[PDB]
Design a protein around this ligand. Sequence first.
Ligand SMILES: Fc1ccccc1NCc1cc[nH]n1
Ligand SMILES: Fc1ccccc1NCc1cc[nH]n1
Lengths: 264, 265
Amino acid sequence: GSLTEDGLSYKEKFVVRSYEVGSNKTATVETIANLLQEVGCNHAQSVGFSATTTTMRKLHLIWVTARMHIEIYKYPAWGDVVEIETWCQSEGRIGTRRDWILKDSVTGEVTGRATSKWVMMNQDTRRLQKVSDDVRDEYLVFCPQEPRLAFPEENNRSLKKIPKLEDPAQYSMIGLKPRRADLDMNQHVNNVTYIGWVLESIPQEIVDTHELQVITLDYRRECQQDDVVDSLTTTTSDSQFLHLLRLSGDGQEINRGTTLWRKK
Amino acid sequence: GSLTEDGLSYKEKFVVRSYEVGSNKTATVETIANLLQEVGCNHAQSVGFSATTTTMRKLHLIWVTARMHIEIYKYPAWGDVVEIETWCQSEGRIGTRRDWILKDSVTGEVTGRATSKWVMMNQDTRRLQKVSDDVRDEYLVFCPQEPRLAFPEENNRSLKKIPKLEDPAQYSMIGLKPRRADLDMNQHVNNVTYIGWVLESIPQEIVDTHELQVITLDYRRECQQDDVVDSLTTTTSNDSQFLHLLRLSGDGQEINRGTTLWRKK
Ligand SMILES: Fc1ccccc1NCc1cc[nH]n1
Ligand SMILES: Fc1ccccc1NCc1cc[nH]n1
């Protein structure tokens, strides 16, 4: 991969792997979400960042995902080359936004797009902190100054408030626990695992007859390595679902989201 | 990737990803095992296979892994390029053997190696069968004629018989179930998931203080999508060795047995 000519975004090509595809021989949404974080990390590395921290290391400050919104028009097939461009932007003292555009390397057509909201927090106390002033200046030289949005439509799906699922859930997948392949290099559960756990409560008939078009996911609390998760789903409708991930025990909320699916 | 000059093996380079590494910032054994199957798949596609033949597809025959043996000397770090060469060989009517050599792309040094035993089975009845001569001839033109082994040693670990773990197991990880990311394109559990399930019953102190050097895994039965698995481990041993058993949580039906060797970091 490489930074673009202006140095304000990063591009990278990926060839879709055999173990990365689902039953329709096209890349899963978890493979797409993993490629999004891989190009995000390479963008950070190329411009001198680590959680993508700056001098926040001495203050014990990290970047954490609050929301992830993915929209896929065409899933790349096994053997296809997919090119992904990513960039960040400051959104005031609330946090930063990272966006992505996914294209077909051959035709040059947009096959997908994603946007994510990130907040600053203290890694130890887990307390959210508003983005200071001299931390803002450190990142600004790597972001476009004019707004550049993957989801430009004012008041779009990525900015829509998500409600809390009411019991009883229509569908459920209980006793979900992470294994070592679900942990990142810092032994925390990978953000991508939570996407798979949400999709576990979608009935197989929906997965077999439909294709996932949109996914919006709020990250309210992290699931520890020794935690057990319940995945809940209710149809709100194309097919739409409201989702909730919570601790199997006391029912403490870890995620809430929505998915939109289209008939194949 | 590409077939070598003689067309009897296939090479491919992989750059290690951020989400592919463990706590010590090096590629996990599950990442390595996934790259081994990816180059195996690309070798098959380059020579006109699915890895079944049109003769095998009309008979509903498939190749299935009976045993996987991996030995890693140095795990590639995040950002490193690793080159893998793979080739197959007929082992008579019992089945085929697929081998791998993993090298550092920069220094050219061997950082790992693997060998797997594959048998033929009817897709539907799950009944095994010895390889027919017309099927044997179809693959022979893609394999070296002289023996070419990743594990040539007189007394090598890849061909040792594995015993059955006796209850009570020293350690256990109960209620393991596969999710959709654990299924392959044919909705079967990926062979790599079984490796992760075996390693789940290794205590975290071992994982944190040691590095996995060797893993031998027998595949006895398949885990269905709706099945629940128990992972059992007992220390059999500076080096640390373990005997492993995967079985259905309910009736205790065996699905895997294996051994792992670990060395102090
Ligand atoms: F890694 C970067 C490259 C260019 C501009 C900004 C960053 N970091 C900010 C950030 C927060 C969450 N992801 N990225
Ligand atoms: F796919 C191949 C390429 C070249 C020679 C042989 C094969 N197939 C045999 C095989 C592979 C795994 N199990 N059995």
